[PDB]
Design a binder for this molecule. Structure first.
Ligand code: BCL
Ligand SMILES: CC[C@H]1c2cc3[nH]c4c(c3C)C(=O)[C@H](C(=O)OC)c4c3nc(cc4[nH]c(cc(n2)[C@@H]1C)c(C(C)=O)c4C)[C@@H](C)[C@@H]3CCC(=O)OC/C=C(\C)CCC[C@H](C)CCC[C@H](C)CCCC(C)C
Ligand SMILES: CC[C@H]1c2cc3[nH]c4c(c3C)C(=O)[C@H](C(=O)OC)c4c3nc(cc4[nH]c(cc(n2)[C@@H]1C)c(C(C)=O)c4C)[C@@H](C)[C@@H]3CCC(=O)OC/C=C(\C)CCC[C@H](C)CCC[C@H](C)CCCC(C)C
Ligand SMILES: COC1=C(OC)C(=O)C(C/C=C(\C)CC/C=C(\C)CC/C=C(\C)CC/C=C(\C)CC/C=C(\C)CC/C=C(\C)CC/C=C(\C)CC/C=C(\C)CC/C=C(\C)CCC=C(C)C)=C(C)C1=O
Ligand SMILES: CCCCCC/C=C\CCCCCCCCCC(=O)O[C@H](COC(=O)CCCCCCCCCCCCCCC)COP(=O)(O)OC[C@@H](O)CO
Ligand SMILES: CCCCCC/C=C\CCCCCCCCCC(=O)O[C@H](COC(=O)CCCCCCCCCCCCCCC)COP(=O)(O)OC[C@@H](O)CO
Ligand SMILES: CC(C)=CCC/C(C)=C/C=C/C(C)=C/C=C/C(C)=C/C=C/C=C(C)/C=C/C=C(\C)CC/C=C(\C)CCC=C(C)C
Ligand SMILES: CC(C)=CCC/C(C)=C/C=C/C(C)=C/C=C/C(C)=C/C=C\C=C(C)\C=C\C=C(/C)CC/C=C(\C)CCC=C(C)C
Ligand SMILES: CC(C)=CCC\C(C)=C/C=C\C(C)=C\C=C\C(C)=C\C=C\C=C(C)\C=C\C=C(/C)CC/C=C(\C)CCC=C(C)C
Ligand SMILES: CCCCCCCCCCCCO[C@@H]1O[C@H](CO)[C@@H](O[C@H]2O[C@H](CO)[C@@H](O)[C@H](O)[C@H]2O)[C@H](O)[C@H]1O
Ligand SMILES: CCCCCCCCCCCCO[C@@H]1O[C@H](CO)[C@@H](O[C@H]2O[C@H](CO)[C@@H](O)[C@H](O)[C@H]2O)[C@H](O)[C@H]1O
Ligand SMILES: CCCCCCCCCCCCO[C@@H]1O[C@H](CO)[C@@H](O[C@H]2O[C@H](CO)[C@@H](O)[C@H](O)[C@H]2O)[C@H](O)[C@H]1O
Ligand SMILES: CCCCCCCCCCCCO[C@@H]1O[C@H](CO)[C@@H](O[C@H]2O[C@H](CO)[C@@H](O)[C@H](O)[C@H]2O)[C@H](O)[C@H]1O
Ligand SMILES: CCCCCCCCCCCC[N+](C)(C)[O-]
Ligand SMILES: [Fe+3]
Lengths: 281, 44, 53, 54, 306, 250, 45, 44, 54, 44, 54, 43, 54, 54
């Protein structure tokens, strides 16, 4: 084990399901109804991935791949050697992720804090379900989802992107990339600013939030604040994931062509459609 | 008389009798359904 | 009798919660399927992104 | 061997029973799915081929 | 419903904070700008004051000339037609010299010279801004974590524009100044060198970008979750740990078996963020100079089927 | 340099990737040890040191000099959690919850916990109080949103517990920290802004019922709040979310 | 075997029954899905 | 005497007796199932 | 060798037992899967070829 | 005696004796299984 | 050389023992897998070739 | 003295037991290596 | 030369020992893998060719 | 040249020693790998050709 301040926080209650049936800790971990569910789902998924490796014929971790059913199977079941193992592993992964989120909700309730962390994890779960459940179901086949391999899911990314030419021209993809880049920049700046305030030039006193505000006001003319930076981080990450899920849910369902051709609507606007010169004249 | 839940020995005995009656009834229903399916289309 | 109904009610509570989640998930999946069938996806069916067929 | 019961003087019965039941069900599901993967022991496929249902 | 502490309910305004003096030259600090209610719904409403020194003047003039060079090239490319300028704004591009010029400075103005001029302007602007980030922290007595975190992004920027083109022997290897054209450059870079997915350092950069989004969603959510105990005052929680820091640590300890401190989480943050461009620069520098086909390389290194 | 290998398939790319693996192992070790400056060494449920301390040793101690003559902090160092905790273990085995032996809100255990912080106000960079009442703060005024001053305050039992009389603003950040609420008996309590919902005609506090407002810890000085008092108030209000549950939606 | 009732002196019956109902429903749905995927036992076709 | 869990020697003995009865019943059912399957399709 | 019992005065029996159980189960699973991945020791395949089930 | 787990010498001796009995049982079962497999299909 | 025991006056016995065991297991696994990867020392394949289990 | 709080005698006894374990492990490894070398020498 | 022991009044013995052990192990592993990568020094391959195993 | 020792009243011996050791090891590894990359100085290949090993 326990942190020096842990003992006063380990109290009964805060469980959505199970009451005191699973209300305990294994080492540092808190177990609940959803902790037991998470363990079962994760163990079954990992063991089935190992069995898929046995069936595939490789033990190289970077060559193991669990492939979804072929397009011929549609949305129905597939033989376990072909795509059935993928379907069971996807069910196990979904169960593990949702049970992880609900276990986090239980821990939040026990600690008397906000539910921001399970809510932010639900965004990643929704992006995953967009890639494995919503988009394949909309498209009509489980084979449009990605395989469970370290380097073969990159092959899926490349093939799906190049089905529509250069995928850079997806506009929601552009917005999501902007959000991801801005989030990495903000994370670097926030870590650096807190560390520079807490770790000044050697022999000097700790700096205050006033110095942080002063430093970014001196640098860029604006400081968002201690609360503002954490709000900004939450929203930047969640916006990036939201727009990723959107750009993938519109791709292959309402847009079927090269994404570069989409931008011709702006070029072909009636007033400047036919003016000679420039790039498109 | 080791108790973690507050039930006495008699309460546990009575509740287990009720539970086992329900378990046997549920298993009998499952057996009947399995026999019906096996008559319809055997799996061995 | 009271105990039998209590045990049955607890078991039905658990089973009904699991079933509600399961059929809610099926309802959402069916919504996505319906939206995908009223879209020109069959005319514009995409190629397979995996080496498997 | 006559002193294995002392496992209950070290490990709480509640956690041990929970873990043992999880492990037993997980192992049984894993073995059943492994057998279903193999064509030689997939009993549904064996019945389909035996009774000419496929 | 329940207040989630994402947008402020009440805005309070007082006299504008002029900042700490420390060892800052106060004559180079401007006045405070206006107050933004729209910005105050999310963070601080106050704009300014900004510091403008010697390096600030150099950086602003250099960056202004960089933007001006690119924009006047765009205006020439439009035929000085404002309507064509708006139509093709994302299609304009200032391209590097052609490969037959190598690294020489003899390329014409419309065939690479103007790109070299703009690149010199950008070089001066970015390095001046780095010196500025160092000196602004030095004036306040702060550690130079911002300067060395900016150097990590400068590393990838230098590799993309300066170091790798020199190692490859031509300025044509560098990135054009345009919206769609630098996307085209990115795609063609991946295509020319096999598959950049099979670059291990591209994979590491992607892992660290994904982990930046991961970690900073986790950190923002954690701080907003314990902000009811004043958890956003992280410096005071480092100096005097409260129940916010303890609850934040215990959530993650009970969830994933280990936690951080109110200080060390920001070390995790700074390192996860800088490693993106730190691994990206190495991955780009190894493309064409060491590996010309990343898929064949991954095949020979157990990453792809043979 | 393309295809040039020292041995096998080992080229500069392989050398770089293995060098980065070594560097990442070292960096993760450093990062994990940097985060063992609070809460370590680990201890049992009776407070004695634990047999298992993990795989990472404690880092060499570091020292912060505090900004305003507030002293010096060395971490990791001896721990300060010596106040009595009104919890009794519900099992002889480790890893089971400890149940309150009284009123958890009054005893400050569980989600109602608080830490023995310094009994001094937080200062800004100029040595003045960081959090001040808005009327005591010079020039401060509400600039946007609904002004909560004068609004009645409703608990989770759908009953009025007092009325808002002031806003305690954070002078450097220029943000509202606390609402001062006058109770029936004429005394006042501080409620964090993050725990209240300002509405058109009322302020709703979902954590506390109307009868739990008098139990909020009181501050010594009417124009000054300390870190210890802040911690007690926030812990009480947040523990209301769990220990005032039987009094909801009434 | 005649002392199995003591399982109700270790685990709370109220929560055990709810969890058991969840288990039984999930197991039934899994088995029904497995049968539904097999051509020789798809009663919906 | 080494009470990590608070069970006495006799409580631990009784609990082990019941746990071992459950284990032996589970193993006997598993043995019958394995023997039936082996008669149906031997894996050796 | 007579003083190996002093391992329990250094390491907690609960942690040691849990870690040993996890290690033994994972090692056994790994060895069984390795044997199944080799066609000359996959007993299901050996039985299928022995009794003409394919 | 003196240690990190607060176990006396006698407690450690008893715990080790029972642990070693369990280890020898597991090893005997494993040896019998290995002998059966080797007779069935030797790997040398 | 006779004073090597003083290594226990410098390093923690628990952490040293855990590192020792983990390192030994990982080294043994690496050596066994390297032997398995080589055709001439894969004992399963060697026995398959010797006994014509192909 | 030292860093770990172990006495000179405690360190000597712990080293004695550790070296007994090391020698047992080494003897078993030597026997295994000799058996493998007789089976398939690697030189 | 007879004054090198003062290295231990400058550097922490624990960190120095751990760093030296890690560095030595990594160096040995790298050299052994380099030797295995060279056909003329891979002892498993050399023995396979010598005894006509592959 | 007889007052170089005063460099130790300017720079910390620990940091100087650590930096010097890291630089020396990196330089030595660089040079050794460069020599191995050169077919005219790869001593393993030179010996393999000299003794007709491959
Ligand atoms: C077909 C397209 C290609 C591809 C080819 C490229 C190329 C080419 C590169 C990447 C690189 C990256 N790719 Mg890739 N990439 C592909 C597919 C992906 C996928 C995916 C899911 O498919 C992911 C998520 C990524 C993600 C990424 C990032 C991890 C990485 C960019 C880091 C960064 O933040 O740079 C943004 C930050 C900078 C560029 C540095 C900025 C610093 C300077 C100083 C900024 C100055 C600002 C300037 C002065 C302007 C001032 C304006 C005013 C202030 C307003 N790639 C494929 C296969 N990718 C890059 C990398 O480094 O990896 C090896 C890289 O070079
Ligand atoms: C939505 C904003 C970002 C985000 C947020 C986020 N992630 C989170 C959280 C939050 C707020 C958590 O609270 C939760 C957590 O606890 O983190 C430590 C988590 C988490 N995000 C994680 C990973 C993760 N997040 C990612 C992304 C993102 N997470 C977003 C960018 C990615 C990416 C981009 O790849 C990854 C890999 C985990 C560290 C953790 C959730 C752990 C978890 O689910 O635990 C239970 C499940 C298991 C132990 C594993 C189950 C394994 C399966 C049964 C089998 C394998 C299935 C898998 C699909 C195979 C993949 C094969 C190939 C594709 C490689
Ligand atoms: C760790 C890697 C990540 C990272 C980190 C990072 N970036 C950084 C930093 C850090 C740590 C800084 O400290 C630094 C900074 O200042 O941040 C606020 C910065 C920075 N990163 C920036 C951008 C940036 N970072 C990016 C990426 C990343 N940065 C990575 C993800 C990207 C991407 C993804 O493309 C961009 C575009 C800048 C905001 C800033 C450096 C700014 C700079 O150097 O500016 C120089 C100026 C110019 C070249 C252009 C000036 C254009 C103007 C029109 C000039 C004229 C103005 C005019 C005179 C005004 C007149 C006004 C009056 C008329 C009223
Ligand atoms: C300022 O405040 C803050 C802190 O500090 C007060 C913090 O610490 C953190 C936390 C952040 C860190 C510690 C930084 C490091 C975190 C990352 C780099 C994120 C990535 C994390 C991982 C890769 C670790 C993954 C670990 C996992 C997923 C846990 C493993 C889980 C299991 C093995 C199963 C768990 C389920 C159990 C145990 C159920 C039990 C049931 C049975 C045993 C049956 C944050 C955000 C913070 O903001
Ligand atoms: C279903 C899912 C799969 C199954 C479960 C898998 C689970 C765990 C397995 C994890 C496998 C990790 C493998 C690491 C390999 C390290 C060695 C290495 O550095 O490999 C290098 C390339 O790998 C590389 O880019 C590796 C780098 C990858 C890109 C970066 C990813 C970083 C992720 C973590 C970042 C923190 C090349 O080296 P070689 O000398 O040719 O090696 C040869 C062997 O690979 C066999 O041919
Ligand atoms: C920049 C970083 C970028 C990528 C790195 C991401 C991986 C970080 C892994 C951190 C692992 C160290 C955590 C740890 O070592 O925590 C230990 C347990 O961790 C546990 O169960 C869980 C251990 C973590 C499993 C991670 C699997 C991958 C506990 O330690 P103490 O007993 O308190 O001492
Ligand atoms: C008395 C008290 C209080 C305490 C006592 C504490 C105790 C007991 C301590 C334990 C004592 C023990 C066991 C000590 C063991 C010490 C050992 C093995 C030391 C070994 C040192 C070895 C060294 C430097 C080797 C350095 C080698 C180097 C650079 C090689 C560099 C090679 C290069 C760069 C070539 C690279 C080549 C290619 C790439 C092809
Ligand atoms: C209306 C008016 C008036 C104006 C409008 C202005 C407009 C429209 C501007 C549009 C600006 C746009 C689109 C900009 C887009 C830019 C983009 C994507 C850039 C992407 C990557 C750039 C990189 C890596 C550059 C790296 C360069 C580096 C390291 C250094 C180079 C240094 C060199 C080559 C020096 C060379 C010279 C000497 C040695 C003397
Ligand atoms: C009329 C009379 C006499 C009495 C009145 C009875 C009534 C009405 C009520 C009494 C109260 C009630 C409700 C009691 C209900 C009790 C019940 C449902 C008990 C049910 C127990 C069920 C159990 C253990 C089921 C365990 C099943 C298991 C492991 C299956 C495992 C299967 C595996 C691992 C393989 C799965 C196969 C593949 C993957 C291909
Ligand atoms: C994607 C969506 C995933 C599913 C989200 C939950 C869907 C709603 O699921 C529904 O929830 C309500 C409570 O709100 C449950 O609650 C209802 O049934 C339970 C069990 O008998 C009883 O407590 C009571 O009769 C009633 O509250 C239902 O059993 C469940 O069917
Ligand atoms: C519905 C379609 C597929 C969705 C997933 C459902 C798959 C079928 C049900 C699997 C759910 C897990 O099934 C259940 O798992 C939990 C762990 O999670 C374990 O549940 C229990 O086992 C034992 C049995 O006495 C209990 O004592 C123990 O306390 C408890 O953990 C068992 O493993 C199994 O009872
Ligand atoms: C900060 C430290 C700076 C110095 C860092 C030095 C790191 C040195 C690490 C050396 C590790 C060598 O690791 C070893 O390299 C050889 C090089 O061919 C790899 O390559 C070997 O296996 C592959 C796969 O079968 C074969 O195709 C290849 O012909 C063979 O040589 C091994 O798969 C790898 O295990
Ligand atoms: C350039 C982007 C910079 C980063 C983002 C900056 C913030 C951008 C604006 C975000 C939206 C803010 O928009 C603003 O939200 C707040 C809070 O919901 C609203 O506030 C209104 O509702 C809240 C909550 O019921 C009341 O307490 C408040 O009294 C009332 O005025 C404002 O009427 C609305 O104008
Ligand atoms: C012996 C028959 C038992 C029937 C059990 C049925 C379980 C599901 C019960 C609720 C189903 C309805 N719904 C939609 C809420 O799931
Ligand atoms: Fe922060």
């Amino acid at each position: 084990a326990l942190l020096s301040f842990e003992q006063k926080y380990r109290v009964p209650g805060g469980t959505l399901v199970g009451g005191n049936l699973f209300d305990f800790w294994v080492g540092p971990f808190y177990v609940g109804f959803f902790g037991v569910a998470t363990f079962f789902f994760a163990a079954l998924g990992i063991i089935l991935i190992a069995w898929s490796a046995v069936l595939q014929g490789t033990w190289n971790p970077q060559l193991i791949s669990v492939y979804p059913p072929a397009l011929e199977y549609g949305l129905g079941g597939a033989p376990l050697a072909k795509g059935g193992l993928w379907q069971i592993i996807t069910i196990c992964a979904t169960g593990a992720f949702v049970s992880w989120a609900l276990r986090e909700v239980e821990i939040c309730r026990k600690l008397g804090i906000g539910y921001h962390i399970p809510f932010a994890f639900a965004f990643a779960i929704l992006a995953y379900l967009t890639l494995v459940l919503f988009r394949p179901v909309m498209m009509g086949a489980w084979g449009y989802a990605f395989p469970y391999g370290i380097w073969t899911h990159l092959d899926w990314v490349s093939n799906t992107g190049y089905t529509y030419g250069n995928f850079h021209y997806n506009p929601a993809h552009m917005i999501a990339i902007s959000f991801f880049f801005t989030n990495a920049l903000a994370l670097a700046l926030h870590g650096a600013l807190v560390l520079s305030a807490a770790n000044p030039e050697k022999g000097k006193e700790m700096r205050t939030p006033d110095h942080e505000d002063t430093f970014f006001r001196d640098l860029v003319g604006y400081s968002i604040g201690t609360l503002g930076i954490h709000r900004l981080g939450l929203l930047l990450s969640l916006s990036a994931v939201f727009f990723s899920a959107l750009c993938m849910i519109i791709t292959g369902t309402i847009w079927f062509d090269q994404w570069v051709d989409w931008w011709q609507w702006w070029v072909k606007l009636p007033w400047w459609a036919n003016i000679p010169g420039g790039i498109n004249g | 008389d080791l108790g973690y839940t507050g039930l006495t020995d008699e309460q546990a005995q009575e509740l287990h009798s009720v539970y086992m009656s329900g378990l046997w009834l549920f298993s009998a229903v499952a057996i009947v359904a399995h026999l019906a399916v096996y008559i319809w289309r055997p799996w061995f | 009798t009271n105990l039998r109904l209590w045990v049955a009610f607890q078991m039905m509570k658990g089973a009904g919660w699991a079933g509600g989640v399961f059929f809610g998930t099926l309802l959402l999946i069916g919504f996505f399927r319906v939206v995908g069938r009223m879209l020109p996806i069959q005319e514009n069916q995409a190629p397979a992104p995996n080496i498997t067929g | 061997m006559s002193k294995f019961y002392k496992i209950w003087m070290i490990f709480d019965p509640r956690r041990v029973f929970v873990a043992q039941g999880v492990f037993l069900f997980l192992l049984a599901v894993m073995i059943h799915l492994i057998l279903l993967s193999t064509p030689s022991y997939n009993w549904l496929e064996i019945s389909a081929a035996k009774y000419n249902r496929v | 419903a329940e207040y989630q502490n994402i947008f402020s309910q009440v805005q309070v305004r007082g006299p504008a904070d002029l900042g700490m003096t420390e060892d800052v030259n106060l004559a180079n600090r401007s006045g405070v700008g206006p107050f933004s209610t729209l910005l105050g719904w999310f963070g601080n409403a106050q704009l300014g004051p900004i510091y403008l020194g010697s390096l600030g003047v150099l950086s602003l003039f250099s960056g202004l000339m960089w933007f001006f060079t690119i924009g006047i090239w765009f205006w020439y490319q439009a035929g000085w037609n404002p309507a064509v300028f708006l139509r093709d704004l994302f299609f304009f591009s200032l391209e590097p010299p052609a490969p037959e010029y190598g690294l020489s400075f003899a390329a014409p103005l419309k065939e690479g010279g103007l790109w070299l001029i703009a690149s010199f302007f950008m070089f001066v602007a970015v390095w001046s801004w780095w010196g500025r980030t160092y000196l602004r922290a030095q004036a306040l007595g702060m550690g130079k974590h911002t300067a060395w975190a900016f150097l990590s992004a400068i590393w990838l920027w230098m590799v993309l524009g300066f170091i790798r083109p020199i190692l490859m022997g031509s300025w044509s290897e560098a990135v054009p100044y345009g919206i769609f054209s630098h996307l085209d450059w990115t795609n063609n870079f991946s295509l020319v060198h096999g598959n950049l997915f099979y670059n291990p350092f591209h994979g590491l950069s992607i892992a660290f970008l994904y982990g930046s989004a991961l970690l900073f969603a986790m950190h923002g959510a954690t701080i907003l979750a314990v902000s009811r105990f004043g958890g956003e005052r992280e410096l005071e929680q480092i100096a005097d740990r409260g129940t916010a820091a303890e609850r934040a640590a215990l959530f993650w300890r009970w969830t994933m078996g280990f936690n951080a401190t109110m200080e060390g989480i920001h070390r995790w943050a700074i390192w996860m963020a800088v490693l993106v461009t730190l691994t990206g620069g190495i991955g780009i520098l190894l493309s064409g100079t060491v590996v010309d086909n990343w898929y064949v390389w991954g095949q020979n290194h157990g990453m792809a089927p043979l | 340099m393309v295809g040039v290998t020292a041995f096998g398939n080992f080229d500069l790319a392989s050398l770089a990737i293995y060098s980065f693996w070594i560097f990442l192992a070292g960096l993760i070790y450093y990062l994990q040890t940097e985060n063992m400056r609070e809460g370590y060494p680990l201890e049992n449920e009776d407070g004695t040191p634990a047999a298992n301390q993990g795989p990472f040793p404690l880092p060499k101690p570091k020292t912060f000099i505090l900004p305003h003559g507030r002293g010096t902090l060395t971490v990791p160092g001896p721990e300060s959690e010596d106040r009595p905790i009104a919890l009794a273990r519900t099992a002889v085995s480790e890893g089971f919850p400890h149940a309150p032996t009284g009123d958890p809100m009054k005893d400050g255990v569980g989600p109602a916990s608080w830490v023995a912080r310094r009994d001094l106000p937080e200062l800004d960079g100029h040595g003045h109080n960081k959090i001040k009442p808005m009327k005591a703060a010079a020039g401060f005024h509400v600039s946007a949103g609904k002004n909560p001053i004068g609004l009645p305050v409703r608990g989770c039992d759908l009953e009025i517990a007092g009325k808002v009389v002031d806003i305690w603003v954070d002078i450097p950040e220029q943000m509202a920290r606390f609402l001062e609420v006058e109770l029936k008996d004429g005394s006042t309590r501080l409620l964090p802004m993050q725990m209240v919902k300002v509405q058109s005609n009322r302020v709703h506090v979902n954590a506390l019922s109307s009868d739990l407002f008098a139990g909020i810890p009181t501050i010594k000085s009417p124009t000054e709040v300390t870190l210890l008092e802040e911690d007690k108030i926030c812990g009480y209000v947040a523990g209301g979310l769990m220990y005032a549950a039987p009094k909801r939606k009434s």
